[PDB]
C-alpha cells in the first residue's frame, strides 16, 4: 500500500535513490502508451500501479536529478500481495522504478526482484531488465 | 423461487483447478413438504417445508396435529418458499447444480448496541487536538431553529445486529449429494450454526 508522503526506493540506475510519492493513479499500459483516468480518488498503490512522485535524493551524475516530478511504477511492497493460488509475498523494503509516459523505464537496469503482478499489467519492458520475478 | 433451508457449518479453503477460493459449507438437509399452500385455498401460491426434527415429546399438541395432517415428523423450523411447487420432499441435490448462482439469506450476527463510528461508519473527531468527544460522538445533530426537527431517519447509536440479510449471486462451488452438504463461494451471514436459506437468484442477470 502506497500513499502520498511514503518515500520509496528507486529500483533502477536512472540516478535518483529516494522518491516521495505524491499521487496514486489507476491507469495501466495501453496501446497509446500509459492510460489516463481510472477514476481519480484511489488512495493505495499496490504492486504494479503507477504513482507520481517527487525525487528527493538523487545521485550526482544522473538522468534524474533532485526535486523532479516523475511517474514511477512499484515493484516491492512491504505490504503483502496474494496470488490466485494463496501464495503471499512481502518484501522488507518498499521500492519503485521511474518511467516515462509509455511504460518504458528511464534507467538501464532494474535493481532487485520485482513482483509478478507487473507481468499481469503487461509491463513487459520493466520485467525484461529484472534479475528475478518473485 | 426454488429454495431450501439448512445451517451454516463453517468456512474453509478450497481449490477449484488451481485457484484457491474461500467456500462456506451449508448443510441443506432434507425438508418435509408440510403444507402445500395454493391461492385457490390460501389466496397465494407457496409451499411450507421443515428442518431439524424436534423430539416429539417437545411438540405442542397443535403442532403435532399440524405435522400430522401431512404425515411428517415434527421439525423445529418451518418455512415457506413462494412460487415453489416440488414433490415428495425437498432434498438439496435436486434443487441445485454445480456453479449456479444462489442467493443466501441468514440472520446477521448481533453486535448489540453499537456507537456511530461502528454502526454507520461515522467519522470520529480528533483524538488529541483538544476535545472531550475524543472519539465516538456524533458531533452536531441538526440545523438550528428552522426545522427544530432532527430528521426522522437520523443515524445514531443503536442495535447493530440480528438483521435478516440477503446476499446475492453466490456461486455453488460443489455439491456433495449423499451428505446433504453444499459449498458456496465466499461468505454467508450469521453466527455458525444459524439457519440460512439458499434460493435461485432474485435477479437472473445475463
Amino acid at each position: 500500500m502506497i500513499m502520498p508522503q511514503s518515500r520509496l526506493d528507486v529500483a533502477d540506475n536512472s540516478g535518483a535513490r529516494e522518491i516521495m510519492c505524491i499521487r496514486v493513479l489507476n491507469s495501466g499500459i495501453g496501446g497509446k502508451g500509459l492510460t489516463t483516468g481510472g477514476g481519480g480518488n484511489k488512495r493505495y498503490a499496490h504492486v504494479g500501479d503507477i504513482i507520481v512522485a517527487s525525487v528527493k535524493d538523487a545521485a550526482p551524475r544522473g538522468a534524474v536529478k533532485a526535486g523532479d516530478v516523475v511517474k514511477a511504477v512499484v515493484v516491492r511492497t512491504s505490504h503483502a500481495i496474494k496470488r490466485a493460488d494463496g501464495s503471499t509475498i512481502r518484501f522488507d523494503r518498499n521500492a519503485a522504478v521511474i518511467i516515462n509516459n509509455q511504460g518504458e523505464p528511464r534507467g538501464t537496469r532494474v535493481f532487485g526482484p520485482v513482483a509478478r503482478e507487473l507481468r499481469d499489467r503487461r509491463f513487459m519492458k520493466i520485467v525484461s531488465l529484472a534479475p528475478e520475478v518473485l | 423461487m426454488k429454495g431450501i433451508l439448512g445451517t451454516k457449518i463453517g468456512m474453509t479453503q478450497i481449490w477449484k483447478n488451481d485457484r484457491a477460493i474461500p467456500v462456506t459449507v451449508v448443510l441443506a438437509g432434507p425438508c418435509p413438504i408440510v403444507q402445500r399452500k395454493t391461492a385457490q385455498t390460501d389466496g397465494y401460491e407457496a409451499v411450507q417445508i421443515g428442518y431439524a426434527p424436534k423430539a416429539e415429546r417437545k411438540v405442542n399438541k397443535p403442532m403435532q396435529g399440524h405435522f400430522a395432517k401431512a404425515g411428517v415428523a415434527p421439525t423445529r423450523i418451518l418455512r415457506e418458499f413462494r412460487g415453489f411447487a416440488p414433490d415428495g420432499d425437498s432434498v438439496n441435490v435436486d434443487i441445485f447444480a454445480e456453479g449456479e448462482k444462489i442467493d443466501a439469506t441468514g440472520t446477521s450476527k448481533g453486535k448489540g448496541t453499537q456507537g456511530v463510528m461502528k454502526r454507520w461508519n461515522f467519522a470520529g473527531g480528533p483524538a488529541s487536538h483538544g476535545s472531550k468527544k475524543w472519539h465516538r460522538r456524533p458531533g452536531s445533530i441538526g440545523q438550528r431553529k428552522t426545522p427544530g426537527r432532527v430528521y426522522k431517519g437520523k443515524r445514531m447509536a443503536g442495535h447493530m445486529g440480528m438483521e435478516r440479510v440477503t446476499v446475492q449471486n453466490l456461486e455453488v462451488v460443489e455439491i456433495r449429494a449423499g451428505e446433504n452438504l453444499i459449498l458456496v463461494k465466499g461468505a454467508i451471514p450469521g453466527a455458525n450454526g444459524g439457519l440460512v436459506v439458499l434460493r435461485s437468484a432474485a435477479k437472473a442477470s445475463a
Binding site: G86, S87, D92, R93, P113 | T12, N17, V25, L181
Partner: protein, 118 residues
C-alpha cells in the same frame, strides 16, 4: 439458529481433507520449495525459493508455511499453503537449532552472523 445434533468438526474435516497434502516435517531450518508458476502466458515454468522457515500455521487445508530469503540484496518472504497446487515440491536443506516457534527476530538481523544454527 437451528439445533441439529451435528459434529461441525467432522463435517468440515471431511471436505477439508480431500484438499490436504503433507510434506517433510520441519519447522525452523532452511529449505527449498520447487514451485510451478504458469503466469508466463500459457507455458509452464519452475522456480526455486530457498530460505529459512520462520513459521508454521494452520491445519488441514488451511495449513501454510513461511520461508524467508535474501534475493539480490533485498529481503523476501513468502507464505505457501501446503495444499497449494503451485507448490510442486519441498525439500529441506539443513535442520536448525532453535529455541522458539516463530523467528521473527530474523527480520531485524539480516546479517551473515544472523544465521541459523546447525
Amino acid at each position: 439458529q437451528t439445533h441439529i445434533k451435528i459434529n461441525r468438526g467432522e463435517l468440515l474435516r471431511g471436505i477439508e481433507q480431500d484438499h490436504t497434502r503433507q510434506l517433510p516435517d520441519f519447522r525452523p531450518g532452511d529449505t527449498v520449495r520447487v514451485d510451478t508458476k504458469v503466469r508466463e502466458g500459457n507455458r509452464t515454468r519452475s522456480q526455486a525459493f530457498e530460505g529459512v522457515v520462520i513459521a508454521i500455521n494452520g491445519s488441514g487445508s488451511r495449513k501454510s508455511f513461511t520461508v524467508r530469503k535474501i534475493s539480490f540484496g533485498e529481503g523476501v518472504e513468502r507464505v505457501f499453503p501446503f495444499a497449494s497446487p503451485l507448490v510442486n515440491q519441498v525439500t529441506i536443506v539443513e535442520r536448525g537449532k532453535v529455541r522458539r516457534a516463530k523467528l521473527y527476530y530474523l527480520r531485524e538481523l539480516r546479517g551473515k552472523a544472523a544465521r541459523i544454527k546447525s
